[PDB]
Structures are given as structure tokens and as C-alpha cells.
Amino acid sequence: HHSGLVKMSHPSGDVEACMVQVTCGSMTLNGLWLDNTVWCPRHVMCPADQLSDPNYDALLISMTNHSFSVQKHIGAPANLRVVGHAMQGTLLKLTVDVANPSTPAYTFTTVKPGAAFSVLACYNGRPTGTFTVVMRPNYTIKGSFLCGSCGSVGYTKEGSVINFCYMHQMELANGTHTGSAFDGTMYGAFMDKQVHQVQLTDKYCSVNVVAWLYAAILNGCAWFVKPNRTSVVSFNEWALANQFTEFVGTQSVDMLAVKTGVAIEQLLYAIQQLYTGFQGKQILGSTMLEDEFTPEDVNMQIMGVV
Amino acid sequence: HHSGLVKMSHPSGDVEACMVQVTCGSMTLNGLWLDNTVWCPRHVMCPADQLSDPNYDALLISMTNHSFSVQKHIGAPANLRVVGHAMQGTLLKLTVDVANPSTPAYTFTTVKPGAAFSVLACYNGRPTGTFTVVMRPNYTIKGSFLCGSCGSVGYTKEGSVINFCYMHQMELANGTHTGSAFDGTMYGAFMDKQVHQVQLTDKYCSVNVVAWLYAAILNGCAWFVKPNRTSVVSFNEWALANQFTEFVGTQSVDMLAVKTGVAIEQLLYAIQQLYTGFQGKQILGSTMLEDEFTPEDVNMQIMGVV
Ligand SMILES: *[C@H](O)[C@H](C[C@@H]1CCNC1=O)NC(=O)[C@H](CC(C)C)NC(=O)OC[C@H]1CCC(=O)N1CC1CCCCC1
Ligand SMILES: *[C@H](O)[C@H](C[C@@H]1CCNC1=O)NC(=O)[C@H](CC(C)C)NC(=O)OC[C@H]1CCC(=O)N1CC1CCCCC1
């Protein structure tokens, strides 16, 4: 029996229309063109033989507006003349002479661990694929990014407003990925330097495991539901010792509890038992806990509720 | 021998000139006036007997520009005319007809666990006090805020640029505090409604304990240093088991190791031992590990290095 759950991304058209290629000499990557501003990773400034320890302050001073070439390749092509350049954290803010006529309604936001967002993977300013990821508790994402993908963007949507939350910077030693928020800070403790970096321990996202167990109930799979309960407080002390995030309830989870008539605390008890082993059984075709679907995913994809 | 370490805030004058009072109906709090924009917590729109379950979308639609009264009390007082209103996350963006003539050079940034920032505590639009805090690993701060303090702001500085990072929203049941970033997201998992909420477990900030042990060494107090070393990888597995954050080195920590000739790994080993007890001894007048001073604090206050 199929759960009805897929990895669903937002439609990407509105964001495709904002993607550009930024070139600074022998260096190129992707940028995001909104209003009169183009955002891109600041290591587009750095020579290859310096990425291990750049002085980004000195590299920025060395640039002029004419040092940057910004091109839109898809749709109606454009070459954008840079009329101002600034640094904000790990991002460049380039001011251009033309406001993007396709600028959508948008905000900038930071995403929190366990939350899902959509990614538009781009190369040389050309969108090539889209996928969705959950921000991990260690501030990485399990993405799909190759050389030349930096500047690819991640976003959520609230109605027709796009909330840009991520712009891609790097791949870590374990194959996961991280990037900047549009305030210029990097997610987690990472620096945009070509050095090996200390990576932090990941955890199960407990609110997402709960959502996935609700999705199983909504598909008639409820062998793991018992009358026994574990309080949120007691689950959260248990979580600290067992590689789980602490559970924080939300209205989205509450809707799942009302729809199914199964209490959150029943599923917190179930998680504690299932973590010690599924004992030959499966849940939604899996023999281990799934934390990559959010309460919002389950409400929208199965119940049609946004 | 006094180490020379105090809780040191930035001079507050530039931020004082940006503070206003914002009143909506019978509700009042503080706002931050930059260029033609005034930022304030959106719960200023909520009547007191509705704070437990506000409908902020409907509240915003019900308001007009005339619903908001913004006043500058400091210096040359002014009543500002609101000419637009909008919501971003947990903040209101009010547009006013006068640009703040004292707007500093500024950015918006998010602060990470363990980093220090300065807070200007305000009441009725009037600055009252300034103090510094470190963001806790559970995204609360140990502040000093009373009724009427919402909209007080926190910030860091780089040169002459003020990086606004915090707008005060709420006090938790354990007496700690939290607030928004200026993208409108709350630090932590917290909602701006008057409902009691799951606050997550706090941890010792490993990088700041290391900074503090270096301050002790710079002060001549080095009885805890041994040849023994614990690697970062091995320290970090121990930290997960003992309610410490994972250690990630920075150039600021590296400068303390060069100056003292004591390796980071020597202090990681020391922390593991000291955490089991100081054996009746003291470090810098304490019998417990101190994590409220950053590597930058020690570099600046003790070695005189920005
Ligand atoms: C930008 O397009 C690019 C995207 C990367 C390329 C591979 N997949 C991606 O997601 N980003 C980079 O190349 C960064 C530049 C820095 C200046 C931020 N670096 C980067 O991702 O690196 C490569 C990864 C591979 C695994 C790893 O540990 N590592 C860094 C090491 C490589 C070996 C030398 C030490 C640093
Ligand atoms: C704004 O000026 C005000 C600042 C508070 C008052 C007391 N000390 C402060 O720092 N903010 C509030 O009063 C918030 C408004 C909500 C709409 C967010 N609520 C608030 O602080 O409350 C009172 C506190 C006191 C201890 C406690 O448990 N509690 C209730 C909170 C706990 C955290 C979640 C919201 C409800």
C-alpha cells in the first residue's frame, strides 16, 4: 500500500525567472536577481590558489563594478551592468541598473532544523533540477550539488510570496551540503573557506517522525499504536540520551492528532519502542524511522490542508 | 589577581538615536527606526485579553496606518506619521514619512549560540540600560527585561557598522528571554502567543569555556594544564554525552593558543576533568566552568586585539 507521500517541491517557475550567472574573471557561479539587486556567494571573488585562506575584505576592496559580469540566459536574455557592490557576511550584494521585471513577491527568512524547503539547482545561471530537503539538526542538508552549483537557491512559499532561505556554498566531508541565509550568515558553524571543517552530529527530527507515524495511521497502518503514553517532558529527557531532537508541538501536529484520534503522547511512546527495533515489522514500507516528512507535508499531501 | 574580564557592551549612543515608542490602541512597546522604516513586535496589535490565540493576519488587515502612533522621545522629539504597514514573521514593518536622520550604517544578521551581543533595554521608547549576553544553545538569553521592554534591540558591531540581531519578545518560565531576528523569525522554536511553551535543554558553550581557560592561563593561573590532549573529534563525542556544545575552532581561538603556547586539545582534556569537579581549587575565582565570555572578549580585553 502506497502512503501517498512523495518528496514534493514547490513549482519553480517564479524562481527560475530570477536566476543569473555571475562572473568575476576566471570565476563564475549563480546569482539571484531581485529588484535591482543580485545576490551571490562571495567566493566568486577568490582566485583558485587562494580559496584555502582568502582575505575577503581585501578581495572586495580590489574589485570595481566593472569587475563583475551578470547575465540572464533563460527566457529573455539580459546583460546587467553592475553599478554598486557590497559584502554581507558570506554573500555579495551587487546593485544592477535594471530591476528584474519578473521579481516575484518575496521575503528573506531563515529555516530551522527539521523544516523543509525547495531547492533550484543551477549551473552557469541555468536551472537544471529541483528537489526538496529538510534542514538537518546539524545545519546541513542532504542535497545533490556538483561543481558550479554554488549560488543555487532554496525557498519556501507562503501563498504567492516566496521566502528565500538558502543559497548554496559547499559540500562537507560526509557528502552533505550547506549554504548561507540571505543575511549572509552560514547555516551552522561553517566558514566559506576551502579547508576541512569540523562537522557536528546529526539527530532524528522527532516532530517529523511523529508526522510520519500519523501518516501511517492515516493510511490504515496502526499496529504500533498502543494505549500507553509518554509525556512530552519525559520524551524530551529521553531524547537527549538517544540522538533525537526535543519534541515541540505545533498546530500542524495537533490537526493530525484530531483527525486520527491518536494522541501525540501515544506516538512518543511508540517512537521509544520502535527505536529499539521494529521486530520484523514495517511501517509504510520502512524498517526504520523516517524523519524527512514534516507535519505540513502530511497535512497537505494526505488531507489537502494548507 | 583580577583577570581584567568584565561584561563589556558596545557604546549605545548610535542605537539610542534609533529607538521609538510604538502605540496601537491601548497597547504600547518600543520600535527601531531606520531610514523610513520602524520595526516592532507584531503583538502590539493584540488586545491584552487575546494574546493567548491571536489571529495576526486578521489583526493586520483590520488596521490602517492611523492605527499606529510612533514617537521619538530622545533628543529632538517627534511624532512620526505612518504611511504604510506590513508584517514580516513576528515583526511589524511600519513605513513612516520621515527618514531617521541619525540612521547609522547597519545590517541585519542572526547571532549563533555562544556569540555575544549588546542589548539596549528600553521602556516607552526611552533607553534605560545596556548589557551584554551570549546566545544560549537553546536560543534563549539570560537577560533583564520587564513588562514594557518588548522591542528592545540587540546588536553587534563591525567597525562603524551596527549589525542588528535581536528584537525582544518574551520571557520564559525559567526566567530566560527570547526574541526575533529582523527577518521576523523567532530565535528557537518559540511562538509569539501567550501560551506556555516547551523550552529546550541548555548546554555549556564549549568554545567559550575554552576562551575562559585561556584567560586564566594569560592571567598566570595554569594549574589545570597537563601534557594530555583530547582531539576535537573525541571531545565532541564526549560533549554530546555531557551537555556541552560541540567545539568548532576559530581564528580567534587560534590566536589565544599561539599567545599562551597551550594547544586547544590540552584545554579540551582539561574541561573533561574539571567538569567532574575542581577538587576544591579555583579558576579565576570560580569553582565552576564559565561559558559567558567569548574568544573575542579574551583577545580584546586581555590582549588588546580587536
Ligand atoms: C560551489 O559551486 C562549490 C559547490 C560544491 C562543489 C562540490 N559540490 C558542492 O556542493 N563549492 C565549493 O567548491 C566550496 C568552496 C569554498 C571556498 C566554500 N568548497 C567545497 O565545497 O569544498 C569541497 C568539499 C568536498 C569534500 C570536502 O571536505 N570539501 C572541502 C575540502 C576539499 C579538500 C581540501 C580541503 C577542503
Ligand atoms: C513585551 O514587553 C513582554 C516582555 C516580557 C514581559 C515580562 N518580561 C518580559 O521580558 N512580552 C510578553 O509579555 C510576552 C508576550 C507574548 C505575546 C509573546 N509574554 C510573556 O512574556 O508572558 C509572560 C511570561 C512570564 C513567565 C511565563 O511563563 N510567561 C508566559 C510566556 C512564556 C513564553 C511563551 C509565551 C508565554
XYZ file of C-alpha atoms and ligand atoms in Angstrom:
684
model
C 0.000 0.000 0.000
C 1.415 3.360 -1.108
C 1.276 6.112 1.528
C 0.543 8.939 -0.918
C 3.708 10.714 0.308
C 6.358 11.893 -2.151
C 9.188 14.376 -1.852
C 7.226 17.363 -3.157
C 8.827 20.666 -4.151
C 7.200 23.981 -4.948
C 6.702 24.784 -8.636
C 9.948 26.514 -9.587
C 8.922 28.884 -12.414
C 8.843 32.058 -10.326
C 12.383 31.378 -9.059
C 13.760 30.268 -12.445
C 12.997 33.766 -13.732
C 15.365 35.257 -11.138
C 18.424 33.075 -11.745
C 21.535 34.587 -13.325
C 25.196 33.823 -13.958
C 27.773 35.951 -12.116
C 31.317 36.053 -13.450
C 34.300 37.714 -11.774
C 37.277 36.909 -14.019
C 38.150 33.222 -14.230
C 35.447 32.612 -11.601
C 31.770 32.020 -12.268
C 28.716 30.800 -10.358
C 24.993 31.513 -9.994
C 23.240 34.573 -8.606
C 19.711 35.602 -7.628
C 18.324 38.755 -9.306
C 15.572 40.509 -7.309
C 14.567 44.136 -7.846
C 17.880 45.966 -8.518
C 19.985 43.508 -6.500
C 21.931 40.385 -7.472
C 22.954 38.056 -4.641
C 25.782 35.538 -4.989
C 28.428 33.744 -2.874
C 31.403 35.948 -2.172
C 33.945 33.284 -3.107
C 33.310 34.210 -6.742
C 35.972 36.853 -5.896
C 38.638 34.413 -4.812
C 41.423 33.095 -7.067
C 41.710 29.317 -7.198
C 45.126 29.300 -5.489
C 43.682 31.224 -2.515
C 40.412 29.502 -1.569
C 42.087 27.855 1.456
C 42.524 31.207 3.261
C 41.081 34.211 1.429
C 41.046 37.748 2.770
C 37.552 38.613 1.590
C 37.841 42.186 2.881
C 40.902 42.823 0.694
C 39.389 40.984 -2.279
C 36.284 43.175 -2.096
C 38.372 46.363 -2.000
C 40.292 45.145 -5.064
C 37.113 44.827 -7.113
C 35.341 47.524 -9.079
C 31.816 47.486 -10.506
C 33.268 46.618 -13.928
C 34.873 43.527 -12.390
C 31.505 41.723 -12.365
C 29.545 40.351 -15.314
C 25.915 39.379 -14.620
C 23.977 37.529 -17.318
C 20.476 36.149 -17.639
C 20.494 33.263 -20.127
C 16.997 31.794 -19.960
C 13.780 33.441 -21.060
C 14.515 36.934 -22.344
C 18.316 37.184 -22.060
C 19.870 40.173 -20.376
C 23.268 41.556 -19.534
C 23.138 43.501 -16.294
C 25.512 46.375 -15.663
C 26.722 46.399 -12.045
C 26.513 49.892 -10.525
C 27.410 49.048 -6.925
C 28.960 46.175 -4.982
C 28.902 45.283 -1.289
C 29.547 42.334 1.037
C 27.152 40.981 3.617
C 28.603 38.056 5.505
C 29.340 35.285 3.030
C 27.319 36.879 0.189
C 27.936 39.613 -2.348
C 25.163 42.157 -2.943
C 25.566 43.572 -6.456
C 23.412 46.547 -7.431
C 22.427 46.488 -11.105
C 20.974 49.102 -13.444
C 17.759 47.209 -14.305
C 15.123 45.948 -11.885
C 14.191 42.354 -12.656
C 10.773 42.665 -14.376
C 9.940 39.151 -13.170
C 10.629 39.856 -9.486
C 8.045 37.837 -7.512
C 6.609 38.870 -4.183
C 9.296 37.723 -1.764
C 10.870 37.813 1.688
C 14.090 36.550 3.231
C 13.831 34.090 6.105
C 15.978 31.566 7.928
C 14.869 27.940 8.067
C 15.078 25.878 11.236
C 16.198 22.271 11.739
C 13.506 19.827 10.648
C 11.826 22.310 8.309
C 11.550 21.526 4.599
C 12.345 23.791 1.690
C 12.636 23.596 -2.094
C 15.981 23.919 -3.920
C 16.542 25.030 -7.517
C 19.873 23.553 -8.599
C 21.530 25.729 -11.253
C 24.728 25.646 -13.303
C 26.109 28.621 -15.261
C 22.928 30.535 -14.486
C 20.709 27.788 -15.956
C 18.225 25.886 -13.763
C 18.750 22.165 -14.132
C 16.667 20.453 -11.437
C 14.586 20.880 -8.324
C 14.310 18.826 -5.145
C 13.204 19.270 -1.545
C 15.287 18.851 1.603
C 14.835 19.142 5.355
C 17.339 21.263 7.265
C 19.161 18.770 9.485
C 19.762 19.332 13.217
C 23.449 19.839 12.390
C 22.627 22.584 9.851
C 23.497 20.582 6.756
C 21.191 19.346 4.019
C 21.362 16.038 2.166
C 21.357 17.615 -1.258
C 22.527 16.983 -4.804
C 25.114 19.587 -5.816
C 28.125 19.431 -8.131
C 30.935 21.791 -9.060
C 29.409 25.026 -10.366
C 26.162 24.791 -8.336
C 27.075 27.468 -5.797
C 24.549 30.238 -5.760
C 21.681 27.766 -6.249
C 18.806 28.879 -4.021
C 16.396 27.326 -1.545
C 12.998 28.738 -0.657
C 9.612 28.158 0.946
C 6.303 29.669 -0.183
C 3.518 31.358 1.796
C 0.705 31.846 -0.684
C 2.291 33.550 -3.670
C 5.144 35.016 -1.583
C 8.499 33.276 -1.985
C 10.601 33.186 1.196
C 14.212 32.741 0.128
C 16.109 30.912 2.842
C 19.264 29.305 1.391
C 21.991 29.915 -1.133
C 24.393 27.104 -1.769
C 28.043 27.329 -0.720
C 29.704 23.969 -0.134
C 29.811 20.198 0.296
C 31.141 18.686 3.512
C 33.374 15.649 4.012
C 30.389 13.336 4.640
C 28.701 14.313 1.364
C 26.124 16.648 2.874
C 25.798 20.314 1.977
C 25.441 23.772 3.459
C 24.995 27.370 2.482
C 24.115 30.882 3.589
C 20.970 32.601 4.658
C 20.356 35.856 2.836
C 21.511 37.800 5.859
C 24.929 36.438 4.827
C 25.373 34.032 7.732
C 26.268 30.425 7.042
C 23.959 27.754 8.421
C 25.744 26.125 11.349
C 29.326 26.875 12.334
C 30.798 26.593 8.814
C 33.146 29.017 7.043
C 33.340 29.649 3.289
C 36.978 28.568 3.032
C 38.417 25.559 1.230
C 39.519 23.707 4.376
C 38.359 20.535 6.120
C 35.769 21.523 8.697
C 34.529 20.053 11.961
C 31.086 18.635 11.288
C 28.527 18.183 14.018
C 26.461 15.136 14.927
C 23.063 14.717 13.268
C 19.900 13.691 15.123
C 16.453 12.279 14.361
C 13.902 15.084 13.988
C 11.284 13.898 16.469
C 8.436 16.156 15.296
C 8.909 14.711 11.787
C 8.935 11.117 12.990
C 5.641 11.871 14.740
C 4.238 13.269 11.484
C 5.309 10.135 9.608
C 3.624 7.879 12.194
C 0.454 9.950 11.786
C 0.766 9.448 8.017
C 0.892 5.691 8.639
C -2.277 5.878 10.754
C -3.931 7.956 8.019
C -3.163 5.058 5.671
C -4.667 2.422 7.995
C -1.292 1.244 9.330
C -1.534 1.475 13.110
C -0.093 -1.725 14.627
C 2.368 0.392 16.635
C -0.378 2.424 18.377
C -0.961 1.301 21.953
C -2.889 2.894 24.818
C 0.431 3.630 26.572
C 1.703 7.202 26.553
C 4.891 9.152 27.168
C 4.613 12.795 28.170
C 6.385 15.459 26.134
C 8.601 16.331 29.112
C 9.605 12.709 29.682
C 10.111 12.084 25.963
C 12.360 15.130 25.796
C 14.661 13.934 28.581
C 14.765 10.585 26.776
C 15.536 12.374 23.501
C 18.669 13.943 24.997
C 20.177 10.497 25.597
C 19.053 8.813 22.363
C 20.049 11.099 19.444
C 16.621 12.733 18.981
C 15.725 16.392 18.874
C 13.391 17.540 21.604
C 9.741 17.493 20.555
C 7.934 20.839 20.241
C 4.308 20.601 19.278
C 2.601 22.754 16.669
C -0.880 23.403 15.359
C 0.029 21.278 12.342
C 0.746 18.266 14.577
C -2.426 18.985 16.568
C -4.521 18.755 13.379
C -3.084 15.279 12.751
C -3.989 14.248 16.300
C -7.598 15.442 15.928
C -8.015 13.816 12.508
C -6.753 10.416 13.707
C -7.863 10.478 17.325
C -4.376 9.283 18.325
C -2.648 11.404 20.957
C 0.864 12.798 20.432
C 1.946 11.097 23.660
C 0.874 7.725 22.236
C 3.266 8.221 19.332
C 6.043 9.469 21.613
C 5.746 6.135 23.443
C 5.722 4.317 20.094
C 8.916 6.078 18.958
C 10.734 4.934 22.122
C 9.797 1.305 21.366
C 10.435 1.487 17.621
C 13.883 2.996 18.225
C 14.932 -0.224 19.958
C 13.924 -2.204 16.854
C 10.918 -2.819 14.599
C 10.991 -6.573 15.411
C 10.430 -7.806 11.874
C 7.571 -5.418 11.065
C 7.446 -2.499 8.650
C 5.756 0.900 8.699
C 4.923 2.466 5.315
C 7.373 0.112 3.630
C 10.221 1.010 6.021
C 12.036 -0.865 8.795
C 13.455 2.319 10.346
C 12.122 5.664 11.480
C 11.578 8.319 8.804
C 12.127 11.971 9.692
C 12.225 13.620 6.254
C 8.467 14.386 6.088
C 7.054 17.335 8.055
C 3.662 17.736 9.747
C 2.863 20.243 6.998
C 3.788 17.645 4.329
C 1.390 15.126 5.839
C -1.455 17.629 6.282
C -1.139 18.931 2.736
C -0.364 15.758 0.778
C -2.772 13.393 2.516
C -5.501 15.645 3.918
C -5.289 18.525 1.431
C -4.863 21.058 4.258
C -2.637 24.134 3.944
C 44.616 38.665 40.566
C 41.708 40.195 38.658
C 41.752 38.906 35.081
C 40.618 42.152 33.515
C 37.467 40.494 32.123
C 34.149 42.314 32.555
C 30.825 42.065 30.749
C 31.531 44.704 28.090
C 28.803 46.200 25.867
C 29.220 48.466 22.877
C 28.702 52.191 23.482
C 24.962 52.538 22.970
C 24.602 56.081 21.627
C 24.155 55.219 17.952
C 21.337 52.780 18.783
C 19.728 55.115 21.337
C 19.129 57.579 18.495
C 17.062 54.912 16.703
C 14.643 53.936 19.494
C 10.983 54.992 19.344
C 7.735 54.218 21.125
C 5.012 52.453 19.142
C 1.400 52.503 20.300
C -1.500 50.612 18.758
C -4.752 51.418 20.502
C -4.126 50.789 24.192
C -1.049 48.612 23.565
C 2.463 50.103 23.618
C 6.093 48.938 23.285
C 9.367 50.008 21.639
C 10.397 50.150 17.997
C 13.578 50.586 15.957
C 13.585 53.464 13.449
C 15.966 53.059 10.488
C 15.677 55.028 7.238
C 11.869 55.269 6.626
C 11.066 52.032 8.472
C 10.054 51.310 12.085
C 10.316 47.673 13.254
C 8.412 46.430 16.275
C 6.904 43.189 17.624
C 3.590 42.446 15.995
C 1.849 41.638 19.280
C 1.470 45.402 19.763
C -1.665 44.891 17.574
C -3.185 42.379 20.005
C -5.594 43.357 22.792
C -4.337 42.012 26.114
C -7.180 39.516 26.555
C -6.452 37.955 23.132
C -2.712 37.314 23.464
C -3.210 33.570 24.019
C -4.523 32.935 20.477
C -4.104 35.953 18.213
C -5.091 35.981 14.556
C -2.274 38.231 13.360
C -3.352 38.021 9.717
C -6.800 39.369 10.579
C -5.410 41.919 13.047
C -3.137 43.349 10.342
C -5.987 43.632 7.829
C -8.134 45.419 10.401
C -5.531 48.113 10.971
C -4.908 51.264 8.991
C -1.861 53.500 9.002
C -3.737 55.684 11.505
C -3.950 52.782 13.977
C -0.248 53.275 14.840
C 1.299 56.147 16.794
C 5.111 56.356 16.651
C 7.010 58.820 18.800
C 10.685 59.707 19.202
C 11.273 60.932 22.769
C 15.082 61.196 22.841
C 16.786 64.433 21.901
C 14.656 66.412 19.453
C 11.257 64.736 19.946
C 8.994 63.933 17.019
C 5.645 62.321 16.316
C 6.079 60.273 13.142
C 3.312 59.747 10.582
C 2.789 56.128 9.465
C 2.321 55.839 5.686
C 2.386 52.057 5.255
C 2.207 48.913 7.373
C 3.244 45.305 6.778
C 4.063 42.132 8.707
C 7.197 40.024 8.393
C 7.062 36.943 10.583
C 6.739 38.091 14.189
C 7.577 41.723 13.398
C 5.723 44.715 12.027
C 7.370 46.878 9.369
C 5.849 50.368 9.628
C 6.800 52.863 6.949
C 6.997 56.465 8.171
C 7.107 59.720 6.239
C 10.441 60.883 7.757
C 13.734 59.044 7.415
C 15.687 58.779 10.663
C 18.411 61.446 10.289
C 20.545 59.509 12.799
C 20.389 56.203 10.913
C 23.772 54.501 11.382
C 25.433 52.283 8.851
C 23.737 48.980 9.612
C 22.992 45.430 8.543
C 20.663 42.729 9.809
C 22.215 39.464 10.957
C 21.363 36.386 13.012
C 23.502 35.518 16.039
C 24.618 31.974 16.749
C 24.729 30.068 20.048
C 27.718 31.194 22.097
C 28.149 34.560 20.382
C 27.865 37.763 22.399
C 25.780 40.802 21.606
C 24.794 44.066 23.253
C 21.233 44.871 24.312
C 19.666 48.294 24.812
C 16.765 47.828 27.247
C 14.032 50.390 26.604
C 10.662 51.293 28.111
C 8.090 53.610 26.457
C 10.627 54.392 23.754
C 13.210 55.555 26.315
C 16.568 53.728 26.692
C 17.057 52.619 30.302
C 20.051 50.296 30.408
C 22.596 48.376 28.406
C 24.070 44.935 28.999
C 25.652 42.110 27.053
C 24.556 38.490 26.692
C 25.599 35.345 24.857
C 23.015 33.455 22.847
C 22.405 30.190 24.696
C 22.482 26.842 22.860
C 18.711 26.584 23.449
C 18.183 30.015 21.768
C 17.274 31.910 24.911
C 19.268 34.684 26.559
C 19.777 35.360 30.253
C 18.614 38.956 30.172
C 16.931 41.561 32.340
C 13.545 42.571 30.906
C 10.293 43.715 32.493
C 6.811 44.445 31.182
C 7.114 47.155 28.527
C 10.587 46.102 27.288
C 9.433 44.427 24.064
C 11.023 45.957 21.018
C 14.315 46.442 22.883
C 17.100 45.573 20.480
C 20.316 43.594 20.451
C 23.198 44.178 18.097
C 26.854 43.540 17.318
C 29.277 45.901 15.559
C 31.984 45.663 12.896
C 33.942 48.869 12.666
C 31.251 51.519 12.476
C 28.546 49.177 11.137
C 25.815 48.095 13.560
C 24.559 44.556 12.926
C 21.098 44.328 14.427
C 20.395 40.762 15.522
C 17.634 40.700 18.167
C 14.271 42.301 18.971
C 12.903 41.371 22.367
C 9.577 39.470 22.552
C 9.063 37.351 25.659
C 10.214 35.879 28.977
C 10.121 32.120 29.510
C 9.014 30.251 32.630
C 12.606 29.697 33.786
C 13.323 33.438 33.712
C 15.268 33.478 30.436
C 14.276 35.547 27.423
C 13.923 35.338 23.670
C 13.042 37.429 20.671
C 13.076 37.759 16.899
C 15.718 38.276 14.290
C 14.925 41.045 11.830
C 13.820 38.559 9.194
C 10.918 38.089 11.602
C 11.800 34.584 12.784
C 11.861 33.836 16.491
C 15.091 32.513 17.931
C 14.373 28.915 18.894
C 11.073 27.109 18.402
C 9.013 29.834 20.077
C 5.656 31.349 19.098
C 4.674 34.922 19.929
C 1.483 33.988 21.736
C 0.655 33.925 25.445
C 0.738 30.157 25.817
C 3.251 28.315 27.918
C 5.907 26.646 25.825
C 8.457 23.837 25.723
C 11.885 25.402 26.261
C 14.717 23.072 25.334
C 17.646 21.956 27.455
C 20.611 24.323 27.729
C 24.257 23.305 27.320
C 27.693 24.627 28.208
C 29.223 26.536 25.273
C 32.489 24.658 24.760
C 34.212 27.372 22.701
C 33.593 29.920 25.448
C 34.790 27.614 28.224
C 37.984 27.224 26.186
C 38.261 31.016 25.857
C 37.873 31.355 29.621
C 40.543 28.761 30.385
C 42.877 30.737 28.089
C 42.035 33.923 30.023
C 43.069 32.019 33.160
C 46.355 30.986 31.538
C 47.031 34.557 30.343
C 46.397 35.602 33.960
C 49.052 33.223 35.332
C 46.508 30.638 36.578
C 47.521 27.471 34.718
C 47.427 24.649 37.299
C 44.910 22.677 35.176
C 47.132 22.395 32.074
C 48.702 18.944 31.511
C 50.540 17.405 28.533
C 47.423 15.292 27.963
C 45.297 16.147 24.933
C 41.798 15.291 23.714
C 41.203 15.701 19.996
C 38.305 17.796 18.739
C 36.616 14.689 17.302
C 36.936 12.841 20.607
C 35.955 15.872 22.705
C 32.823 16.278 20.591
C 31.617 12.719 21.216
C 32.113 13.397 24.935
C 30.275 16.731 24.712
C 27.136 15.079 23.314
C 27.146 12.831 26.390
C 27.730 15.642 28.905
C 25.525 18.602 27.872
C 28.297 20.614 26.173
C 28.088 22.058 22.687
C 30.370 20.590 20.072
C 33.632 22.523 19.761
C 34.419 24.296 16.482
C 37.700 26.197 16.371
C 38.052 29.721 15.017
C 40.912 32.074 14.192
C 40.124 33.903 17.454
C 40.705 30.737 19.491
C 43.861 30.051 17.463
C 45.281 33.431 18.468
C 44.839 32.524 22.141
C 46.686 29.227 21.671
C 49.624 30.936 19.955
C 49.817 33.587 22.672
C 49.700 31.140 25.596
C 51.533 28.246 23.951
C 48.765 25.913 25.143
C 47.051 23.817 22.499
C 43.264 23.684 22.132
C 43.395 19.927 22.693
C 45.099 20.442 26.050
C 42.140 22.538 27.226
C 39.601 20.065 25.821
C 41.230 17.435 28.017
C 41.188 19.856 30.955
C 37.466 20.566 30.538
C 36.640 16.857 30.744
C 38.496 16.584 34.048
C 37.312 19.901 35.505
C 33.684 19.074 34.702
C 33.897 16.215 37.214
C 34.989 18.743 39.867
C 37.585 21.412 40.609
C 38.920 19.411 43.602
C 38.474 22.368 45.933
C 40.577 24.597 43.693
C 39.503 27.751 41.871
C 39.975 29.177 38.394
C 39.667 32.964 38.059
C 37.841 32.973 41.392
C 35.246 30.386 40.277
C 34.632 26.773 41.278
C 32.570 26.121 38.124
C 33.201 26.355 34.397
C 32.380 29.774 32.943
C 30.952 30.000 29.419
C 29.737 33.614 29.231
C 32.992 35.051 27.796
C 33.917 34.587 24.142
C 37.335 34.144 22.486
C 36.902 37.669 21.112
C 36.243 39.007 24.630
C 39.537 37.496 25.817
C 41.535 38.659 22.769
C 40.187 42.212 23.082
C 40.014 42.791 26.831
C 43.187 40.964 27.903
C 45.487 41.095 24.838
C 44.131 44.364 23.425
C 43.339 42.973 19.967
C 40.112 43.677 18.047
C 30.493 25.968 -5.438
O 29.939 25.654 -6.700
C 31.029 24.698 -4.807
C 29.919 23.661 -4.640
C 30.473 22.300 -4.220
C 31.411 21.633 -5.220
C 31.202 20.146 -4.971
N 29.809 20.105 -4.540
C 29.403 21.248 -3.993
O 28.339 21.418 -3.370
N 31.642 24.992 -3.513
C 32.938 24.786 -3.261
O 33.705 24.299 -4.087
C 33.437 25.167 -1.866
C 34.236 26.467 -1.917
C 34.656 27.022 -0.558
C 35.502 28.276 -0.726
C 33.439 27.319 0.303
N 34.230 24.116 -1.256
C 33.771 22.855 -1.191
O 32.620 22.521 -1.363
O 34.771 22.014 -0.851
C 34.742 20.690 -1.426
C 34.452 19.678 -0.330
C 34.433 18.233 -0.826
C 34.539 17.445 0.480
C 35.294 18.374 1.390
O 35.710 18.124 2.520
N 35.422 19.543 0.762
C 36.367 20.587 1.128
C 37.803 20.091 1.244
C 38.321 19.586 -0.093
C 39.762 19.096 0.017
C 40.669 20.182 0.558
C 40.161 20.684 1.896
C 38.720 21.177 1.784
C 6.777 42.574 25.956
O 7.082 43.833 26.528
C 6.787 41.474 27.002
C 8.167 41.328 27.650
C 8.128 40.356 28.828
C 7.157 40.709 29.944
C 7.761 40.041 31.167
N 9.189 40.100 30.871
C 9.444 40.188 29.567
O 10.569 40.122 29.046
N 6.378 40.209 26.393
C 5.402 39.448 26.893
O 4.815 39.727 27.936
C 5.066 38.164 26.132
C 4.033 38.428 25.037
C 3.648 37.209 24.197
C 2.556 37.552 23.192
C 4.862 36.637 23.482
N 4.606 37.119 27.031
C 5.259 36.882 28.182
O 6.410 37.190 28.403
O 4.444 36.240 29.050
C 4.783 36.276 30.456
C 5.795 35.192 30.794
C 6.201 35.234 32.268
C 6.724 33.822 32.520
C 5.897 32.986 31.588
O 5.780 31.762 31.609
N 5.332 33.801 30.688
C 4.433 33.356 29.636
C 5.125 33.243 28.283
C 6.188 32.157 28.293
C 6.893 32.062 26.942
C 5.899 31.814 25.826
C 4.840 32.898 25.809
C 4.133 32.991 27.158
